[PDB]
């Protein structure tokens, strides 16, 4: 007897990591070390039926990680008071292209100690007077933290197992020949991104495309790669940390010192991989639903900055990248058809977590010149509903609900229970 769907997930993690960094603090507080036994061991026959996209385990891992995020919001992060009005100016003393600025170095009036005293203070805002924040601002900061995803294992309790499709070619709703039962997963890293999977897991054999409803264009298409497309992101923006402890209740930072005039924040994607991978993707598409069609990739359709750009994080700052460079190639149905692609990005401090309960700020980006090298492990796509007279199919970057990213990770785990 195998009964499914039980919100019960054990956890596993730790080696050299402890506290400080918020991910490290979290894994430390919610996980115990693992053991290198796990045997799984598939048993002969025992079914061919499965369906990864109706897994409530995903929704569990999701709501868990978010609640944990609030549990991090509790101690140090400041929901108040200082965002009122900003006396900002610009470093532009001569100009072309009407650049204005995303980053501004500003002056302020700040409650320090005692009653109603102020001192002149530097403030930076990522996006002249006023302007403030809109109806919420939690400021994370904190003395000892950081933000890098840490491997988190999900395990089944006592009297429970987890079946696992080891079939390389799964239709997602369908015929699976090899079922095994593991007690604990290998350890999943919590990468929060859209459009591409960064870090994550690779396909064992070939590139695999997966959709909950290949006809319904509103449903996402998790495209998993057998190979990584490079992406190196260098944001050489510089900020010097100054945390003025002037008052007991108050804990203020001061960023925006020095210089270096770094261009925005910068990134790259490396293309050779992107050439073969995109060709092979249109190959898979044309060997699945797309039989004879020219495949075109336009950029994001529009929306919130988190939706229009590849919004991901390089250690707690929220990067937004113009994504035209990833989606600007028309793939000819007839046949297939040192330079690197350089993508324009921006660092944000003010992000909107949760629902609207509050905004989250990583206030003092420490140091400067911080490059994050990543492996493009993925694509999350939504199809542009087209016609058949166009003799072409258009595909756009979609996403937003990270639960889709977990289905893209938790695709081979379904918690089950055993009965005599």
């Amino acid at each position: 007897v195998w009964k499914d769907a039980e919100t019960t997930l054990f956890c596993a993690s730790d080696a050299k990591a402890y506290e400080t960094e918020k991910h490290n603090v979290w894994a430390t507080h919610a996980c115990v070390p693992t053991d290198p036994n796990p045997q799984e061991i598939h048993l002969e026959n025992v079914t061919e039926e499965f369906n990864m996209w109706k897994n409530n385990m995903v929704e569990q891992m999701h709501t868990d990680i978010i609640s944990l995020w609030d549990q991090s919001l509790k101690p140090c992060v400041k929901l108040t008071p200082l965002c009122v009005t900003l006396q900002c100016t610009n470093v532009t003393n001569n100009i072309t292209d009407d650049m204005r600025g995303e980053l501004k170095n500003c002056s302020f009036n700040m409650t320090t100690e005692l009653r109603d005293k102020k001192q002149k203070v530097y403030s930076l805002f990522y996006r002249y007077r006023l302007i403030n924040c809109n109806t919420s601002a939690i400021t994370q900061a904190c003395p000892k933290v950081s933000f890098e995803p840490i491997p988190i294992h999900y395990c089944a309790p006592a009297g429970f197992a987890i079946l696992k499709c080891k079939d390389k070619k799964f239709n997602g709703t369908g015929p699976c020949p090899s079922v095994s039962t593991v007690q604990c997963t290998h350890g999943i890293k919590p990468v929060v991104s859209t459009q591409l999977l960064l870090n994550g897991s690779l396909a064992e054999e070939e590139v695999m495309i997966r959709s909950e409803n290949i006809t319904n264009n509103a449903k996402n298409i998790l495209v998993q790669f057998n190979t990584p497309v490079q992406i190196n992101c260098t944001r050489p923006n510089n900020n010097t940390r100054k945390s003025i402890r002037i008052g007991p209740g108050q804990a203020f930072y001061a960023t925006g010192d020095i210089i270096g005039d770094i261009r925005q924040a910068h990134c790259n994607v490396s293309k050779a991989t992107w050439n073969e991978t995109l060709g092979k993707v249109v190959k898979q598409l044309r060997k699945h639903f797309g039989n004879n069609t020219i495949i075109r990739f336009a950029n994001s359709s529009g929306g919130d900055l988190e939706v229009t750009t590849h919004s991901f994080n390089c250690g707690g700052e929220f990067f937004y990248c113009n994504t035209s460079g990833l989606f600007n190639s028309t793939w000819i149905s007839n046949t297939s058809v040192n330079d690197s692609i350089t993508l324009p990005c921006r660092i944000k401090q003010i992000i909107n977590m949760w629902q609207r309960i509050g905004q989250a700020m990583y206030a003092p980006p420490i140091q400067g010149v911080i490059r994050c090298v990543s492996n493009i492990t993925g694509l999350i796509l939504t199809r542009d509903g087209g016609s058949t007279n166009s003799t072409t199919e258009t595909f756009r970057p979609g996403g937003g609900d990270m639960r889709d990213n977990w289905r893209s990770e938790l695709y081979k785990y379904k918690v089950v229970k055993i009965e005599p």
């Epitope: 260098t234 050489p236 270096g260 770094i262 261009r263 925005q264 910068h266 330079d339 350089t342």
Partner: antibody, heavy 132, light 106 residues
Framework: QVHLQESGPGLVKPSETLSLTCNVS????????WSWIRQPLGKQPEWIGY???????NYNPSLKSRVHLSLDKSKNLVSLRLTGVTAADSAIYYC??????????????????????????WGKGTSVTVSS | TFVSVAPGQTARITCGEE??????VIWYQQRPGQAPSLIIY??????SGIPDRFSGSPGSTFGTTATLTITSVEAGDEADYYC????????????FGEGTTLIVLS
């Protein structure tokens, strides 16, 4: 192997038009930038211009009004014409396969980004003498 | 100009104006009776068939001249050498730098 062979008249009278051909094997002309370069006797090379099927084409300003570069995809060759020649145009002329590179820095240094070209496969060259 | 050196020793060749902006210098080697042939691109990158005896000076310190260094020189290195300078503050150079003749005193 990519292989270029230039041909021309060897001798041209002053005021006449010099016409040169570069026969290409081992690659298709549409898939490369092509550069004509010239080098007088006892002197350093003097380039001529670069041409691409895309239209990304440019001529040495000093020769601007007298020079024409072309690609012939059907015959897989590259051509040059230079009008109103004088003795100053006497040189060995070379056809080349021209690769493109970029110097890329941080965005803070965007004004200093630039492209450069290098000639990686040269023909054997054709000799041109203009005199009366 | 001219540069002479004994076999096994190191030769150095200077070419072009002092740098003004950021640089990409291309070096070519031309043997007697032959077409020019290359040596280096992107200041210190070599194409297929060129050994690491040949090295170019970085497109770096402002107000300096590009230099090609050849270590462990052999008689086969005897040739004319030319540079083609790309400098971010200068016009495209349509003429190569003045050449230098390397003499190997065998």
């Amino acid at each position: 192997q990519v292989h270029l062979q230039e041909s021309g008249p060897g001798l041209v009278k002053p005021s006449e038009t010099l016409s040169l051909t570069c026969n290409v094997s081992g690659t298709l002309v549409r898939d490369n930038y092509w550069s004509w370069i010239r080098q007088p006797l006892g002197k350093q090379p003097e380039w001529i211009g670069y041409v691409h099927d895309s239209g990304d084409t440019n001529y040495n300003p000093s020769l601007k009004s007298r020079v024409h570069l072309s690609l012939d995809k059907s015959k897989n060759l590259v051509s040059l014409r230079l009008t109103g020649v004088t003795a100053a145009d006497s040189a060995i002329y070379y056809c080349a396969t021209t690769k493109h590179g970029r110097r890329i820095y941080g965005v803070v240094a965007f004004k200093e980004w630039f492209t450069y070209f290098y000639m990686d496969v040269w023909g054997k060259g054709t000799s041109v003498t203009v005199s009366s | 100009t001219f540069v002479s050196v004994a076999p096994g020793q190191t030769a150095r060749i200077t070419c072009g104006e002092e740098s003004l902006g950021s640089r990409s210098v291309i070096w070519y080697q031309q043997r007697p009776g032959q077409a020019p042939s290359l040596i280096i691109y992107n200041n210190n990158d070599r194409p297929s068939g060129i050994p690491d005896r040949f090295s170019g000076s970085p497109g770096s310190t402002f107000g300096t001249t590009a230099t090609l260094t050849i270590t462990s020189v052999e008689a086969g290195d005897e040739a004319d050498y030319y540079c083609h300078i790309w400098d971010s503050r200068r016009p495209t150079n349509w003429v190569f730098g003045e050449g230098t003749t390397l003499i190997v005193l065998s």
